[PDB]
Amino acid sequence: ISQFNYKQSFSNPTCLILATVPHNLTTITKPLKYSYINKCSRLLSDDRTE
């Protein structure tokens, strides 16, 4: 998930926070399912190299 979706910047001081919305707060809209890209790759024109 960090490798192919979102990576935090090492040079800038960064804080990673995981939070769960409370039942009382209805402003957020729940997504159908959590979705991340497992791998991202580019196939070269030759097709022997990816």
Next chain:
Amino acid sequence: LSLFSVNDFTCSQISPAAIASNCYSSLILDYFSYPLSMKSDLSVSSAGP
């Protein structure tokens, strides 16, 4: 191709130029006696015998 005149050249799910250009992890070559007349009967997938 030089050694044997090619009566029919066909490639399924691949391009003949691509197979030659790309290195192959494995290569299987199959040789069997086959009649020239039954071109249709020979197929990668068919309901033919």
